[PDB]
Structure formats: structure tokens, C-alpha cells
Design a protein around this ligand. Sequence first.
Ligand SMILES: Cc1cn([C@H]2C[C@H](O)[C@@H](COP(=O)(O)O)O2)c(=O)[nH]c1=O
Ligand SMILES: Cc1cn([C@H]2C[C@H](O)[C@@H](COP(=O)(O)O)O2)c(=O)[nH]c1=O
Ligand SMILES: Cc1cn([C@H]2C[C@H](O)[C@@H](COP(=O)(O)O)O2)c(=O)[nH]c1=O
Ligand SMILES: Cc1cn([C@H]2C[C@H](O)[C@@H](COP(=O)(O)O)O2)c(=O)[nH]c1=O
Ligand SMILES: Cc1cn([C@H]2C[C@H](O)[C@@H](COP(=O)(O)O)O2)c(=O)[nH]c1=O
Ligand SMILES: Cc1cn([C@H]2C[C@H](O)[C@@H](COP(=O)(O)O)O2)c(=O)[nH]c1=O
Ligand SMILES: Cc1cn([C@H]2C[C@H](O)[C@@H](COP(=O)(O)O)O2)c(=O)[nH]c1=O
Ligand SMILES: Cc1cn([C@H]2C[C@H](O)[C@@H](COP(=O)(O)O)O2)c(=O)[nH]c1=O
Lengths: 292, 292, 292, 293
Amino acid sequence: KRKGIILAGGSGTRLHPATLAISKQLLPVYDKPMIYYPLSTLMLAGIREILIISTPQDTPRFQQLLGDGSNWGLDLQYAVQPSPDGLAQAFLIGESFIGNDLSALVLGDNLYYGHDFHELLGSASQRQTGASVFAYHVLDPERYGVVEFDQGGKAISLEEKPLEPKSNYAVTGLYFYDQQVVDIARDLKPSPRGELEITDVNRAYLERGQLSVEIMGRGYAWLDTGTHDSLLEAGQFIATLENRQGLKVACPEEIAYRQKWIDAAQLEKLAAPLAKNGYGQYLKRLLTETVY
Amino acid sequence: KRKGIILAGGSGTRLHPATLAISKQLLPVYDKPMIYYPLSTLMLAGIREILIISTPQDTPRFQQLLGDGSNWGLDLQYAVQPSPDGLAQAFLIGESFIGNDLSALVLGDNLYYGHDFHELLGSASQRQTGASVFAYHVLDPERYGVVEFDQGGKAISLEEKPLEPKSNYAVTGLYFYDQQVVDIARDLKPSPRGELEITDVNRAYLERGQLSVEIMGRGYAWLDTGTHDSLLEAGQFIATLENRQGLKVACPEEIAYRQKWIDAAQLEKLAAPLAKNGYGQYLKRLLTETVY
Amino acid sequence: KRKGIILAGGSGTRLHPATLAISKQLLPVYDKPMIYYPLSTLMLAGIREILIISTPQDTPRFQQLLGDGSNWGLDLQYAVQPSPDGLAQAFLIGESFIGNDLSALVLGDNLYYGHDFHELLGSASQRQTGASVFAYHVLDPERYGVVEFDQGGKAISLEEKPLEPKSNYAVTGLYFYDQQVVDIARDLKPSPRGELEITDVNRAYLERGQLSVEIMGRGYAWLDTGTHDSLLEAGQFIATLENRQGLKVACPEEIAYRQKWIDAAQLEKLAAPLAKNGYGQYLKRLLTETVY
Amino acid sequence: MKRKGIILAGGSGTRLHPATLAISKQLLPVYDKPMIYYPLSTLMLAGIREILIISTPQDTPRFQQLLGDGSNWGLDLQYAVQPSPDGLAQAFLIGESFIGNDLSALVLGDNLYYGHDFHELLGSASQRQTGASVFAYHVLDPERYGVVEFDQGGKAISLEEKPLEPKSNYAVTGLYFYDQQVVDIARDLKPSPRGELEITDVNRAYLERGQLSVEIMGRGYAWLDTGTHDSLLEAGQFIATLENRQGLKVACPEEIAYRQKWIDAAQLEKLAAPLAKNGYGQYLKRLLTETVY
Ligand SMILES: Cc1cn([C@H]2C[C@H](O)[C@@H](COP(=O)(O)O)O2)c(=O)[nH]c1=O
Ligand SMILES: Cc1cn([C@H]2C[C@H](O)[C@@H](COP(=O)(O)O)O2)c(=O)[nH]c1=O
Ligand SMILES: Cc1cn([C@H]2C[C@H](O)[C@@H](COP(=O)(O)O)O2)c(=O)[nH]c1=O
Ligand SMILES: Cc1cn([C@H]2C[C@H](O)[C@@H](COP(=O)(O)O)O2)c(=O)[nH]c1=O
Ligand SMILES: Cc1cn([C@H]2C[C@H](O)[C@@H](COP(=O)(O)O)O2)c(=O)[nH]c1=O
Ligand SMILES: Cc1cn([C@H]2C[C@H](O)[C@@H](COP(=O)(O)O)O2)c(=O)[nH]c1=O
Ligand SMILES: Cc1cn([C@H]2C[C@H](O)[C@@H](COP(=O)(O)O)O2)c(=O)[nH]c1=O
Ligand SMILES: Cc1cn([C@H]2C[C@H](O)[C@@H](COP(=O)(O)O)O2)c(=O)[nH]c1=O
């Protein structure tokens, strides 16, 4: 069994005053809440039991939004991160939730999209030992954890926000772990930046030869809503795809149904109060149209 | 002396699920909350005393974001509209706030921008008798109150969301009134749509020969940010202007300073907590740069 | 070996006056000419010998832009389509070019993108019998050839621009054919719309049980620059991906180098004249950077 | 009084290659119509009917194919070649015969202006009969343009061309109005350090004589430059947003011609006919019966 975690807290200050009223992850991307996107990523990976970690103030907001998850065939739980003191804190806050299971962590403002994503997730998901992360070529690797490869394509180093990046491959905000992750996180000390760093957790696996680094090719989109510009671009990206296709991206209701976590009747009931708009009309359409 | 009202409620049904555990007029338009835009419009009209009317759920959210306005040299008050039963309800909810003063109403999701806008507003503000509204050419006039002109350019009729519009001129969501408006609203009955209609208020002034309809030229932008698509377009519009100019659109801090409602010391103190980002850095710059 | 055709002609009357000056397929999509995109698609399918068909006025302009292709390891040839009388005319105009070989046709204004695209292409291109086309879920199937599937997923009918589509699956503007296509096209007569239709070619194959319809999943982007709005959307889509990734979409120089059709020395020479710009700088970077 | 117009639509295309290998930047569409319609429309709105379009030797025939002699729009369009992009002031040398003994105006072919009361801002400048007039606009990146510095009283005191350390954030836009002194000023210029015959140097000549009028173009106007891939996209989106919202089109020369009475209703109807199967033609037709304020 693999349990999921969505880390959806974080500083806030960079995007104020936009984020003074609404935290990033509660800011919607085009037609649905930002959190739907990383949630749908965990769902597509086959994960149904998910811990949502947020700020003290947002945690109840997330509860109002998503509830216990039973509507979507999920088991959703909530915990608080008092201060954004590092991605790795997710494993300390989520220690009891994880128990003795495997796990996966996704960042609440990360938006993934592309063909054969289910396979990419599936292969990481099937690894019962070690950790798996994904490498994506970016313009600005200095903003991320950076993974360096040797001439043979083997991952050989990790550095967090390096002033002098060794490659243009960023480690994306999606991570799969075996049962070791909690104890690794328990042993970490704050970095210079003052954070309990996921890069340090991933490096612990790398130095034991237990880190799988999979390329996420250029045909995928991996976007982050970290800036005003990047939220706008992400919105435009989703809107172009949706309006071209007549399909919606990262609808949890759709994914639940396709995965047999909810049935047609359940789906019909979810669509009713959204009936007056495109999103409800869309869910109803799913009951009678085959989509490959 | 004119008091202002921002009517920022409305059914959110259309925009769900994007706006579920948050407020729709708190969504960013690019880089700042949507409500900053209409607020800035009233401020540019020389209005300091403003009543913000929203839903039971969202009114507290506005208060938390904007406070009493004193930081910006404003007097902000708040009131609740229990149910979205008409734009004209603003004048009933707002009756005691208005007192014996002139007034102006702007809708929370209306974004205006253009050259000489302060003159356009100044002109309506300086009419102490009757009402003033603005007509703007649109592609889909059936969505709005529509104003028909005679061959001489005189306004001759108003219809609310007509099936067969008599022109392509929509009445925008910005309205200036003398002391007759509360009494006119007091006497209204709900329409066939089942709403207490601002068009019926504007028609009451027109039937007495006391409605001024001013053309808002095609050089102005009048955007309505109340749909997912139109929110994205508005965001891009503001981003293009801001990044081209190195100026920000609709910063209340700037407008308050320019109007001498707050002094330099005050502006400096507002910028401090936003210092880490572009917005705080911008406010600081206004202290030592002349902008015409 | 399979030969390719890019049909890059067509009535421009729609996009006038924007295309009064230029053929639609010479307009840039963001940072490079539209024709680079379908050219790159053929290259990615392993096709090196390509006939570009355009109008009398433009064909020489395409020759000016692309030359004989030798610089990119290609064999580019040219032919004129006197009048835009149907997509199937490509096979009559290109009869001598195709000779006794397998072939592929791509429309000059079609932009495809997504993960594992080279696999989707290679599988169709490496078939040696029948015809292969791709079905993509769209909002507006009435604008395209539409494929209807039975309950088992088997394609059962094709209709060109039906007013009441039987599905939401459009046939995309990318077609792969065995040696039967020319004789099929020769027997066609103009449709009700006045055109020699590729849909009729594809039906001929379907009737013989020799049409392979492969799904192009929602993870792929299939865009059409046929309208002002859609060309703008496609530009933003490419811009977002490029700026995120620090990679460029559909650079023929890159693809030729990667396929080993040109070497490093040749790539370096192609970059030099573009060195003062981002595109040339990019081609240079590819010489010392490994991209997975 | 008549003013003659010049659109300088030449330039090194190297930057935008390969997008502009096929087409010159100034023929690329901004959303729905060719880039050059925009600065052409600016001149038209200023009351200028007689215009010289300057471009490279390769592009000159392309502009001539698109626009012709302008008679269909009530204009008198002429063409000339700039052999090499050796300075904006070259426009006055190349255009000397064309200008003759008249007032003149120069607009750059990739400059897009839009906003309320723009006709008034233009008419004020164009109706002056002395000196030069230019416009100052606040930008984020003044180092890309000519930059004007003001004193504490708002009077222009200096001009610098593409300064590494701008003295202000006010760029001089690519729209210039001149009296009959300009040709002789340009004739006396020598190339700058950038190796160009600079319009900034022409403008400084006027400033030194106290004959340069620098008018602020306020923040409510949009002044966009389509000279990069990103900027052309943003400009397209800007136009598309306004057009789709309004049901009106920006910088349609047929509309402006008709509104200025340079062509009549029958003429407009004929222009609409060949574009009728699209929205641009349908739009021209609509203008014959709808009053637009
Ligand atoms: C550092 C940190 C980030 N975050 C969130 C914000 C985004 O959803 C995500 C990315 O954060 P970042 O802005 O530091 O790159 O992780 C936390 O939730 N907690 C933390 O301690
Ligand atoms: C190799 C290569 C692929 N492509 C396109 C083909 C696809 O749409 C995508 C390949 O993505 P992938 O590596 O994730 O399968 O990139 C380029 O545009 N240029 C290239 O050089
Ligand atoms: C009808 C109504 C609208 N509104 C807000 C909703 C939008 O933000 C805007 C548009 O209203 P309308 O298009 O339904 O006339 O007005 C209220 O705040 N209260 C109301 O009673
Ligand atoms: C009259 C006219 C104006 N314009 C432009 C000029 C300004 O940018 C704008 C005029 O706006 P205004 O009517 O609000 O002053 O519209 C056109 O693009 N076409 C026209 O036919
Ligand atoms: C009908 C037709 C289209 N075309 C071109 C124009 C495009 O690249 C594409 C389809 O254009 P369309 O928007 O007119 O259907 O193929 C031709 O080259 N020849 C033709 O006979
Ligand atoms: C099945 C499904 C996939 N997706 C996303 C996941 C990947 O980003 C993408 C998969 O596309 P594919 O079918 O071409 O592999 O679509 C949804 O957004 N909703 C869904 O219901
Ligand atoms: C210098 C120069 C520029 N131009 C064009 C190029 C641009 O589109 C614009 C701005 O040029 P600039 O950025 O080099 O001052 O003017 C010419 O047509 N001829 C010239 O001699
Ligand atoms: C003074 C000021 C105006 N504006 C807006 C009001 C109008 O839409 C526009 C005025 O432009 P203008 O100076 O060209 O008349 O700018 C702000 O957004 N912030 C400000 O501080």
C-alpha cells in the first residue's frame, strides 16, 4: 500500500497582495482549484489515501473544499505545518499517517500533464524499495533541486538551488519513497537556508545507491504556480487544451469514475449541483461518452 | 460629498468549483485581488468613504483583507447582502450609509482602464442633480443593460438583458446618483428575472429626463472578470501593460498617495512588509520617481 | 523508406487581411515559421525525402526559405497546386514524386506535440500496408473529418465536416499510406463541397478493412492554426513550453542532428548565422549539452 | 495644413530569424491584420493621407503588393528603399524629395499605439506648424530607446540614445512630427557611436534651439513595440482582448478612411465584398449601418 501526501502550505510573501486574501494553492488554475491538479496526480498513480498538509489557517479551508474524500472514493486526512520550515517536514508531520507503508509526496502548486503519464507514475509506484524522483529540463535550474548525470545517464549528484548548477535538470515536486523515508527525515538537520530539505532526503537514498531518477521528457508539461506570471501561463495552458479538446484536465470526479472508485450513479449525483455550468455539464457527459 | 458602494456579492454557482472555499472577487487579476480594481475606480473618482457589500461568507473576507481603510486614507464600511436579489438592493442595504449624500456604485468584478479616465469620472462626479451612467460598445450586449440612442445620439431607452438588443451599447457597472436614488429603489418591485434591477433605477431617472448617458469610448478597456475565460484575458491585459510600463494598474496605495490621502511616511510604512516583492519595491520607488 | 508530402497551400480568404501579405504557413508560430512544425513531424517519423506543395505564388517562397534541404540532411522538392481543390490532390500532384513508395501527408498548418510522439509516429511509419490515421478528441468535430467507433473501439464510419457529428473524434491532418493511395485518389470525383477529399481516400481503405485508426490521446496537443484565435493560442502554448524548459519545439536543425542526418560540425555552421539571437545560441548549446 | 507621412518599416531582421526569414517583421500579423496597418492607421488618424513607406529592397515589393497605391482607401501611398538600416534619420534623406517643402511625420513600422483620446493627442501635434513634437512614455526598459530627462518642473533637458544608465524611465516613442527644418538637420548629421544616423540627434537639434515639444503619453495609452517574439505575442493578445470584448476592430484602415470621409459608403461596400466570407469583411459591412461613437 502506498499513501500519498500533498504539501500545500508555504511562505506566502512573494505573491502578496494577491496571496493576502488567498494562499497560492487555493488559487485556481483556469476552471478548478490549484489543489485538484496535484491531487489528480496522486489519484492517477493509484493512490486513494491522502494526507493534505497545509498552514494552520488553510487546513480547514482545504477541509471545506475537499471533505473526507468519500465522495470521490478517497480517504483524505489533514495535518498542519506550523511554519514552512522545509519540504522534508512532511514526513515528520505525516509520520503517524504513513505508518509502515510506502509513500509519495507531491507539492500543492505543481501541475503535471502529458501523454503516458499514467505509465511514468506506474513504474515509480511499482518500486517497493528505494526512492524515485523525476528529472525535467528547465531554463532556470538554480530555482530547484538539480540532478547531475554522468556521460552514461546515471544520476551522480544532487544540489539544492545551486548558484552554479551542474545541469539543467530540475528534480520535480513529486517523490516516491519506501519505508525508510520517515527515519531519514527524522535524522536531518536544517540546512543553511534554514530548511529541512527534501534534497537531503533524496541524497540519503542516492548515497546508498537506492535513488531512481527517471527522466520526465520534454513532451510533458511540468509547471509550478510560484509567480504571478507562472499562474497566468498555467491558466492559459489548461484553457487551450480544454477548449481544443472538449475535455477537462485534472477533474477528480472523472478520474475516480474511470478508476472505478465511484460508480455512474455517484458520478451523476456529483454533477447535479454543477449542472448549471460547464463543469457539471461535463461530468454528466462522461456518463454516456466513451473517451479513450 | 459622494459616498461610494462596491457591490461584490453574487451567485458563485457559475464559477464553481474554481471558487469553492474562497471568494471570487478575491481572485487575482494578474498580481492583485480583483476588488482592488473597482476600489481604485472609486478612489480615482475622489471617493474616500466606501461601503463594501458582499455575501454572508465573503464580507468577513473583504474585512480581513482591507480593514477599515485608514491605512490608505479611506473610510471603509461593510454590509451583507443575504441573497443576490438585485443590483438595486445596494441602495436599500446602503440606505443608512448614504444618508443625505450623493452616491456612486461600482460592481466588484468590473475593471476599467484608460487615458483621461479621471476626467470621465470627474465629469459624472460633478453632476449634483440626476444620475450618470456610461455606455460602452460590446460584442454581446444581451448580457447587460442595453441603452438605445436616437439619430441625434440622445439616449431613448434602456432594457435589461434584452433578447433583441436595440444597440450594441451596454451600460457599464459604474453608476453615479443624486439623493433620489434610495427612494427610487425603495419603490421597486422585483422583475421577471426576479431581481431588484439597477436598470429600473436608471430608467426612473431617464423617464424624468434626469439620466446622463456618457459614452465610454473604444480606447478604454471595460472588462468583466466574472468567467474563467474573461479572468484570464483580464490578467494578461494587466500583465502586458504592467510589464511594458514598469507601472502597476490599480494600486490603492499609489492612488491614495497621489491624491494626498496618505503622506510619504505612510506610503513608506505600507511598502515595508511588501519589500521582498515587486509590489513593495514598486511602492518604494514611487517615493522618489516622478510619474506623469 | 517512406516519402513525405507537406500540403501548404489553401485558400487564405479566411485569414485575410492577415494573410493577404503572407501564406498562412509562413506566419510564425511564436518563434519559428509555421511550416517548421509539420516538417519536424515528418522528420520525427524518419522521413527525409519530402515534397512541399503550395500555391503558385508561394511555392517559390517556400523554396527560398527551405532550399533543397541538404543543409538539414533532407531532400526537399517542390510542386504547385494551381487551385485548392482538395487534400487528396496531393497524391495526384505528387504521383511522380511518390513513385512506388510508401508515403505520408501532413498539413502545413498542423502542430502536434507530446510525450512519446516519436513512438506514435514510428509505429505508423514503419507499417508497410494499408493506411494509418489518428483520432483526437475535440470540442468541434464538425470542423473536421469525423471517425465513429463501435462499442468495441473499431472504426465504423467516416464523415467529412458533418453538421451532426457521430462522435467527438476528429481525424487529424497526418496520414500514412501504402502503394494503393495514388490509384485511389485518381478514381475520386469532387465532393458536394467541390473538393477531392482525403476522407474519401480514407473511406476507401476502411471499406477494404485496411484503415488503421490509432487514438492520439488527450496527453498530446494537436493544434490547428486555421484562425486568428487559434494561431495566437498556439503561439502562447509554444512560448510557455519553451520558456519553462529552455528547449525549443520543432527545430529542424536539432532534429536532424539528433537523427544523425547532420553532424556537429554541420550544426555548428547552421548556428553561426543565427548566433546573435536566442535560436542560434540554442543550436550552439545543443553541441555540449546532453538532452534526454 | 497638409503633413506628409513616412512609415519606416525596414531594419535588420537578424534578431527575429528564423521567424522573419520568410516574412519581414512588419508584415507579420498582430492578431488579425498585418503589423503595418497599425502605424499606417496612426498616421491616418493624424489626418495624413500622403505617405511614404520605406523598407528594405527585398521587402519593398511585398509592401507594394499588400497596400498598393492606397487609392482604394483614399490615400496616396509611395514606396522607397533603405539600402541598409543605418539610422532612423535616414528616413529624411531617402524621403527628401517626397517631403518637399511640407511638414512631415515619421512613425516606425513596428510601433502600435492605442487609447482613449488618441485622435486629440495626434491632432494637437499634427496641427502645430513649427518645431518638432515627440512623445514620452513610461517604460520598464528605457535602455532600449531614446530617453528623455526632465527637470523638476517637467521640462525636457536631455536626450540620450539607448543609454546603459538611463536618466529616467521615459522613452521617446517611435512617432515624430517635424516642421520644414528636419531635412536640413538630417543632411548635416554624421553617424553616431552605434554607427547610425540617429533620430535622437535630430531631436536634440530641435531641443537645443528650444523648438522640441515633448508631450507626455500617459499610462492610460498602450504603446507597444512588436520587435521580439514575446512582444508580438503580447500585442496580439492585447488586440484580441479588446476586439472580442468590443465587437470593434483596432486599426482597420477601411474604417478610418470611411470615418474621415476619405472614401464613401459605396466604396466601403466594395472593399468589404472580397472579405465578406470572413469576420473582417462582415465587420466592414456592419459599419455602413451602425453608428459607433
Ligand atoms: C518550504 C516549503 C514549501 N512548501 C510548499 C509550497 C508549494 O506548494 C511548494 C513549493 O514551495 P517553494 O515556493 O519553497 O518552491 O511547497 C510547503 O508547503 N512547506 C514548506 O516548508
Ligand atoms: C527530439 C525532439 C523532439 N521534439 C518534440 C517531439 C515531441 O512532441 C516531443 C518529444 O517529447 P518526449 O522526449 O517527452 O517523448 O518533443 C522536438 O520538438 N525537438 C526535438 O529535437
Ligand atoms: C444580482 C447581483 C449581482 N451581484 C454581482 C455579481 C457580479 O459580480 C455582478 C454581475 O451581476 P449580474 O450580471 O447578475 O446583473 O454583480 C451582486 O453582488 N449582488 C446581486 O444581487
Ligand atoms: C475611429 C477609430 C479609432 N481607432 C482607435 C484610435 C484610438 O486608439 C482608439 C480611439 O478611442 P476613443 O474613441 O475612446 O478616443 O481607437 C481605431 O482603431 N479605428 C477607428 O476607426
Ligand atoms: C483544401 C486544401 C487545403 N490546403 C491546405 C491549407 C492548410 O495547410 C490545410 C487545410 O486548410 P483549410 O483551413 O482551408 O481546411 O491544407 C491545401 O494546401 N490544399 C487544399 O486543396
Ligand atoms: C484519464 C485522465 C487523464 N488525465 C490526464 C493525465 C495525463 O496528463 C493525461 C494522459 O493523457 P494520455 O491518455 O494521452 O496518456 O491526461 C486527466 O487530466 N484526466 C483524466 O481523466
Ligand atoms: C536603425 C533603423 C531601424 N529601423 C527599424 C527597425 C525597428 O523596426 C525599428 C527600431 O530600430 P532601432 O531599435 O535599431 O532604433 O526601426 C529601420 O527601418 N531602419 C533603420 O535604419
Ligand atoms: C494615477 C493613477 C491612474 N491609474 C489608472 C487610471 C486610468 O485607467 C489610467 C490613467 O491614465 P492617464 O494618466 O493616461 O489618464 O491609469 C492607476 O491605475 N494608478 C494611478 O496611480
